[PDB]
Swiss-Prot record, chain A:
It is found in: Cytoplasm. This is Accessory gene regulator A. Residues 5-100 form the HTH LytTR-type domain. The gene is agrA. It comes from Staphylococcus aureus (strain COL). Required for high-level post-exponential phase expression of a series of secreted proteins. It comes from the Bacteria.
Length: 100, 99
DNA sequence: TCGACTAGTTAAGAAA
DNA sequence: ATTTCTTAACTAGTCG
């Protein structure tokens, strides 16, 4: 039926719907990502490559970011800033921005 | 999911089909105004192309393409189309009956 | 409910 | 990116 992702943190896992997530970014903690949800961030163990491979909507817009295409509100290609439905934003690399 | 890209110079804003009530031509040549639930967006496009996108986008009038999904009611005598967000547009005599 | 005569207006291609 | 020129095609109103 539904499409969800398991975010693992040690003995925890938190379960979240694909489109509950705006984007992922790499954490300052090695081997952890930050899922940016509608109204809170979640830190968890994962890799951006694997996440981008999950679904066509998850696109590697930047070495440090995988964005959920479904939650992109707008794109400024000059500045290469991607804005999301929840008012957050991230940055896109020069090479990848046009292909979002 | 079905969404549309509204292009403003280097900007593009991305909006879901049914977030949009209708489009109207702007006073600025070659621009349209997308009427959303709680905001209007000006952008470059043509009504013909938009009406071709989907069966729900119907050219009810030379200056308007309406999203059938968001039509609340229709007064055919006055030829006024009302939308779920409490605004309206007009339909041309020829096209009103075919909405 | 329909055409049909009029007169004023505009969408969108080209092109700049 | 935004505009100028262009005109076929549109529009509302009227009248029957």
């Amino acid at each position: 039926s539904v499409e969800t992702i398991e975010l693992k943190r040690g003995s925890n896992s938190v379960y979240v719907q694909y489109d509950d997530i705006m984007f992922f970014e790499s954490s300052t903690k090695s081997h952890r990502l930050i899922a940016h949800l509608d109204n809170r961030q979640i830190e968890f163990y994962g890799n951006l490559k694997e996440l981008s491979q999950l679904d066509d909507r998850f696109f590697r817009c930047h070495n440090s970011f995988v964005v959920n295409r479904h939650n992109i509100e707008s794109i400024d290609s000059k500045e290469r800033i991607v804005y999301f439905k929840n008012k957050e934003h991230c940055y896109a690399s020069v090479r990848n921005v046009k292909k979002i």
